[PDB]
Design a protein around this ligand. Structure first.
Ligand code: SF4
Ligand code: SF4
Ligand code: F3S
Ligand code: F3S
Ligand SMILES: [C-]#N
Ligand SMILES: [C-]#N
Ligand SMILES: [C-]#N
Ligand SMILES: [C-]#N
Ligand SMILES: [Fe+2]
Ligand SMILES: [Fe+2]
Ligand SMILES: [Mg+2]
Ligand SMILES: [Mg+2]
Ligand code: NI
Ligand code: NI
Ligand SMILES: [O]
Ligand SMILES: [O]
Lengths: 595, 267, 273, 595
């Protein structure tokens, strides 16, 4: 069949079908199927979420004050963001305002998560779509040092002998014949474009990032007890502050703990600027001629907006939200998560049931009733899917739409929205990164012509990857600002951390509804709660990867993942490096997507 | 040659993999490069699709009876198992196949040990912990390492024990290593002097909260929860829930999601 | 400009300087380069002899009333003070001169706070803590930061407090910052559940030792000792005496060397005694 | 006067007198006076220990089991070595044998101390005698990087931009006008011979070492509770082991703690090999023409011997002891700390009294009775010493002699003794170091003629400094061996840590005496105890700096410090860089010396 979607794609499944199940180097479980034409260009793509747990069902009847801990376990990668969304949703329902230190500590935890999550995504899940560790073994260590000095002159770790030592360790591993996580990788595919030296630099940095990442999450351990899965609470934060009073050493937050947080913040900022951001720029330059994967990013993007410099004043959001539609960056449509005409979820192509499956349901009206049922065109059986039938229900992921539009969410969405709204920090990052990109390009090709077209540059899998790194850097700077504000608050007399006026359910209205939003690492997150007589009557989550990984809607619009693969050529369709490189650029969180 | 490890993922949030890589000592890089051979692991592995599947086939035959099967998450039994699909088939079938030729199983976390969040009422997918899915007739050790997630250095401490001392650590009656799971939080809790004195947090951010008083009256489940949080602590010994001001929620114990409100007192 | 600090050294073992440089956060490097101006310090300073003394003279003038005087060790009064000679003169003369124009004094460790080991019976040098040496009439704050040595992050935590919040921390009656010294070891000890159950180490390396039972019966002085060891802990939160299996010896408390054998059992344990 | 000493020095105090008080960048308090001839050559040297506390007096009447904690507070720099000596002395007196794992853990703690102490000494105490931080501000960062890569090819930290960043930090510090620890340094004295690039490398490494040193002592925290001043006990170690039994997580030593120790050991080995040892070799090569300071190291050296591969078998000491006398490296005289004709202390030129001051007292017979008394030729007064009278009592340090001989102690002494006794690890270190030294020399001087004479090479201030660094490296390798032995012991069933058979004084003889020896960082340490009816009747310490810093004996022999300075030319007698450089090479511990 050849389907002409209202969002302007032609999904053609007559060519050769290629199945990727499992999709690895994601959180959770995904299947992807594509069809390629005679020229090995993707002409159909199918996103299937292959897990479901049912947290929305499990929450019914429970106490709103407990909900955060349940929903935190939607995801251990984006750990905490669902807790934040939950406590915000309850606070919204119950009209609880929290103390400024609680706002600040929650933002510090959120930015810690952003940094941790982005760094681990890029190195440990994405990089092997761009980096060939076997090829690293061919690198000249001196030339690797020269590259390193160009890529990031301030990073201290550049000795030829260091790169040689890393290479010796890799070589020993390969020589052992126990190739582990590298086993059967697609390393002979010409899709890999780094030089040996860049491959060695990037493997070196993979290991540096693995060592570093455990440090930054100590901020979560200080404020929230543990990482993964730090604690939150409705009305404040549990980490009470006592800097110089009786028994201060035994309070959660004291002078020593604050000094520790300062140290950890600075370490993160340094890794962002000296290791992560320079690497993404440099790798992008090696891949300067591979500008595939933009998908919807050029046309339709959305975020709820986050990080208001003034608590509770969204016009002060440092990552302002809204929706850009049909590629008009000059028009920011306001996004209201309360409006039943805006966010809606369809299940026409998902493994759920609605009474009227023609409807898209706003999440205060949402329904989660499982319906695992395969289309009569499936190749295979119910417990052995050979080729899924995307004409019918084909995913555990619901289909969210915004005013009927399919949109992309994530750091790239936020970066476009911020650029378009005049956020100068973001504009500077973009322009300086474009310039740095073109400088590396020129180093690689003195015949290079610079890239000036921001839409082409950002609206690509490379650009999606770059926006994530830039966002990490911005989050470190913001988190230092938050820390300094926390110290200022304390200095001026305010050590308060919780509002308990509405802790007791006897203070609650018999009926209430609320929504909490978060700029989660992968995009726009919100939780919608309906409370009745002290209990959860409905709890619906719509998560970033639900938006990006969405199956088709009743009108046939495709979602961000499917759109991003359309038109991409594959060197070797049976070695689908290009598909993995673009899907991974969305940082798919499949446990999130389905919850 | 390095001990082969196959790390399977069922219904999960991936918090157990994430915790593992936090290990301060040994470092995850050194575990993977030098101590074990991490032969299959959805989260970090290069291969996908058919190429991934082929490793399982190869490791199974090649190292028959000689690999450790580590399991994160758990198998669902509802939806014909297709609430967790891997390679077009139920995860339960992958788990069974690999379990059949494992030397031993490590059940990471509360998901694989007990069921964790997806198994909380009403358990829509009939998510089932590994030992119950394999049943009483399973003839190899199942090491339960519970917690949501477990402490990083507990995870790598179990592995280093096995590798250094060449045996399964001694287990309690619930299958948990006595190395880490043979005391309750409350049996080693630094706020115990306050418990003993009747000195409690009564309301968030009260005088007691600011002094580090005991969290019993705000719901701490430390008195009934076996783990190393009060001894080893979290994230390179930085903190643990109670240090940072929130009671234990019981996250290493079977059924903790359905024990009542986290803020209701332990009984 | 960075707060001037003069760090004098009397009769001492240097454990307090050593502890200071162990600080995990802030790092000692950052304290010295960016937070304070460490203008005199025998252990680390470039200058010796006459060039060292000249720094005293100059700082004292230039920053009169504006430097913090930190003191490690203590002055002896016997031997005409010449059991601690600095520049050919008694250390007590150096201490007095610099105290006269300090903004505030930090008494580092048990030596400066209380007397520590050299003041244990029979105190052959008449080693005297700073506050007693300067007497009742001294009109600037003396911040006692006791312990043998104090915890590193406590030492740097006192300095960062003062630099960040622009005030002396609140002190208890003994002059110790409530930030760190306002609980006993035993008020926050993770072995307390064992104490309460009557579960003790009775002999070294017995069953209880191997399970982490309470150290009371082998002499732990945690019931009478005020410090941050059971909360902040030592060496970047790595351990503290009790965690590693030896009782507290009371090392932050006045007179701990002569309180009794370290293996004698602590007193005043019953509310009916 | 001109005094012709029996150990062949001519002490001539007719030239100009130079006084250094305080001697800084030592532990504790020292005064040094010299006389220089008209050519600015030192022809007299006077070592004065300027503090005393009286630990030997304070111990009387106390319980032997408590002694370790008192004497540990002799010194916070060599923290724990006195505790080790004390428990050994008590165990000797009472015929206590401790479990193997206690032996091992004590040796691990001892080697941790060696590494920590040696590194901090070289960088934070010694280096400013060789390194000019103001001149570092002149360095070219790229040429600094080139030097670094030659000095230590494996060390990762070599980026030009890193050295430039360090240089900018030091420039900001200097430009502040608050020069702190660098204020009034003798930075214009031509005695400083590094290039700007070597100065910048060394300052960089000073900072790296300040950051590093706090890590290695976490081994003391694990086994001993804290650093400084970890705990010990008579009969074993308090850190009970439980790897996999009930309540293991709450034991002092469990699996996680062992893993932590492993990590710390390896970090220390790496820093030794990649930073410390290469720096001493390179600095030595810049100072290849400055071979002063050998003193007694050319003739008379001693250590008690340490680190037996077979517990309690000294023929297996990995740093074997003895005494070399009159330069005959072919004759190792056995040293017995029990023999009253061997170790003796005189007080003729010390501020103490004996009933018969002609006597040298073996320490079981020792007496510590203070006698602050200045000679009638003193310039100044009792509380204002302008020039001390070294013909009378001039120090708080007693005068130890071995069979009447003045000897040098310390890492250099141990290295000469080990070399001469065929310890292959040491011979290899010495030869490889000589080879590396000559290679760095030829880098700097392409016409360099190789040094081949080991006596000349080792017998100098440079050699003393090198031996300390080599010892650090050896200690790291030995500690790794010890750890592996501990693991093997536990694996084979032995988790025992204490012997309590003689804990109770009722089990003791009414009268007992013992001696405990240690290879302390600075040299030969021993404690001698006499017990009577449960109590300390006498307790005498003789510590490494007591030997090295000794004043003259009744026959007029000079000690190691005074000897080391004789014959040294000074560029600027009143900016006595050379005196500090040589004295600091002994790593004087003045609180130790006098106790
Ligand atoms: S109830 Fe919780 S906070 Fe209180 S002593 Fe027990 S474990 Fe600690
Ligand atoms: S006596 Fe010591 S070990 Fe026992 S609970 Fe008190 S402080 Fe802890
Ligand atoms: S909630 Fe879990 S992490 Fe530890 S403190 Fe309680 S077992
Ligand atoms: S001996 Fe001192 S270090 Fe702390 S535990 Fe006791 S106050
Ligand atoms: C999810 N981010
Ligand atoms: C998350 N997505
Ligand atoms: C001391 N050595
Ligand atoms: C120590 N001498
Ligand atoms: Fe997510
Ligand atoms: Fe010493
Ligand atoms: Mg949902
Ligand atoms: Mg003595
Ligand atoms: Ni997620
Ligand atoms: Ni010493
Ligand atoms: O997720
Ligand atoms: O010392």
């Amino acid at each position: 069949s050849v389907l002409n979607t209202p969002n302007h794609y032609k999904m053609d499944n007559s060519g050769r079908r290629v199945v990727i199940d499992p999709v690895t180097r994601i959180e959770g479980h995904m299947r992807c199927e594509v069809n390629v034409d005679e020229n090995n260009v993707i002409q159909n793509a199918v996103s299937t979420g292959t897990m479901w747990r049912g947290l929305e069902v499990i929450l019914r009847g429970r106490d709103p004050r407990d909900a955060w801990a349940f929903v935190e376990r939607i995801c251990g990668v984006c750990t905490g963001c669902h807790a934040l969304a939950s406590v915000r949703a309850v606070e919204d329902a119950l009209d609880i305002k929290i103390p400024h230190n609680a706002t600040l500590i929650r933002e510090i935890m959120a930015k810690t998560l952003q940094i941790h999550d982005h760094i681990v995504h890029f190195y440990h899940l994405h990089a092997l779509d761009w980096v060939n560790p076997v090829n690293a073994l061919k690198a000249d260590p001196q030339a690797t040092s020269e590259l390193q000095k160009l890529v990031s002159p301030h990073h201290p770790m550049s000795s030829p002998g260091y790169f040689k030592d890393i290479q010796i360790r890799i070589q020993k591993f390969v020589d052992s014949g126990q190739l582990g996580i590298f086993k059967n990788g697609y390393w002979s595919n010409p899709a890999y474009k780094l030089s040996p030296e860049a491959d060695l630099m990037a493997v070196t940095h993979y290991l540096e990032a693995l060592d570093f990442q455990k440090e930054i999450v100590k901020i979560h351990a200080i404020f929230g007890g543990k990482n993964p899965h730090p604690n939150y609470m409705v009305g404040g934060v549990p980490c009470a502050i006592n800097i110089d009073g009786d028994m201060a050493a035994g309070a959660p937050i004291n002078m020593e703990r604050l000094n520790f947080v300062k140290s950890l913040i600075e370490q993160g900022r340094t890794f962002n600027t000296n290791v992560y951001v320079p690497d993404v720029i440099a790798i992008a330059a090696f891949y300067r001629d591979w500008l595939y994967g933009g998908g919807l990013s050029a046309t339709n993007v959305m975020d709820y907006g986050a990080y208001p410099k003034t608590p509770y004043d969204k016009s002060t959001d440092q990552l302002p939200g809204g929706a850009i539609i049909n590629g008009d960056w000059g028009k920011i449509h306001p996004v209201d998560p309360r409006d039943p005409e805006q966010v809606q979820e369809f299940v026409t192509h998902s493994w759920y049931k609605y009474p009227d499956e023609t409807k898209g349901l706003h999440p205060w009206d949402g329904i989660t009733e499982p319906n695992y049922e395969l289309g009569s065109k499936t190749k295979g059986s119910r417990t052995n899917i050979i080729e899924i039938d995307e004409s019918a229900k084909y995913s555990w992921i619901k289909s969210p739409r915004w005013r009927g539009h399919a949109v992309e969410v994530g750091p790239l969405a936020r970066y476009i929205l911020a650029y378009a709204q005049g956020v100068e920090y973001v504009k500077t990052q973009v322009h300086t990164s474009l310039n740095r990109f073109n400088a590396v390009c020129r180093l690689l090709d003195p015949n290079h012509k610079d890239i000036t077209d921001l839409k082409a540059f950002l609206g690509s899998t490379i650009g999606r990857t770059l926006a994530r790194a830039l966002e990490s850097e911005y989050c470190g700077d913001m988190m230092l600002d938050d820390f300094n504000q926390l110290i200022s608050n304390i200095k001026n007399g305010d050590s308060s951390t919780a509002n308990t006026d509405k802790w007791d359910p006897s203070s609650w209205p018999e009926h209430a509804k609320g929504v909490g939003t978060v700029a989660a690492p992968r995009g726009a997150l919100a939780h919608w709660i309906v409370i009745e007589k002290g209990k959860i009557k409905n709890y619906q989550c719509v998560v970033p990867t639900t938006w990006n990984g969405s199956p088709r809607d009743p009108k046939g619009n495709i979602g961000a993942f499917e759109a991003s693969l359309m038109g991409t050529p594959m060197e070797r369709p049976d070695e689908p490096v290009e598909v993995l490189r673009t899907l991974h650029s969305f940082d798919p969180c499949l446990a999130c997507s389905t919850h | 040659p390095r001990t082969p490890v196959i790390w399977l993922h069922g219904l999960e949030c991936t918090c157990c993999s994430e915790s593992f890589i936090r290990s301060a000592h040994p470092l995850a890089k050194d575990v993977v490069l030098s101590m074990i051979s991490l032969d299959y692991d959805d989260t970090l592995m290069a291969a996908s699709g058919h190429a991934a599947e082929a490793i399982l086939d190869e490791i199974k035959e090649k190292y028959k009876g000689n690999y450790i099967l580590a399991v994160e998450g758990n198998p669902p039994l509802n939806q014909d198992g297709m609430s967790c699909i891997i390679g077009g088939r139920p995860f339960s079938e992958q788990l069974k196949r690999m379990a059949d030729d494992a030397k031993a199983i490590i059940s990471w976390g509360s998901c694989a040990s007990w069921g964790c969040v997806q198994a909380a009422k009403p358990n829509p997918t009939q998510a089932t912990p590994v030992h119950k899915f394999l049943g009483g007739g399973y003839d190899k050790p199942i090491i339960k390492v519970p917690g949501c997630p477990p402490i990083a250095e507990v995870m790598t401490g179990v592995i280093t024990y096995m590798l250094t001392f060449d045996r399964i650590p001694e287990l309690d009656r619930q299958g948990r290593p006595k190395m880490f799971y043979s005391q309750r939080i409350h049996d080693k809790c630094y706020r115990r002097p306050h418990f003993d004195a009747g000195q409690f947090v009564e309301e968030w951010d009260d005088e007691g909260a600011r002094k580090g008083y005991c969290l019993y009256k705000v719901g701490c489940k430390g008195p009934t929860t076996y783990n190393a949080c009060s001894t080893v602590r979290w994230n390179g010994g930085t903190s643990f829930p109670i240090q940072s001001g929130h009671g234990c929620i019981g996250c290493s114990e079977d059924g903790f999601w359905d024990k009542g409100s986290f803020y209701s007192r332990d009984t």
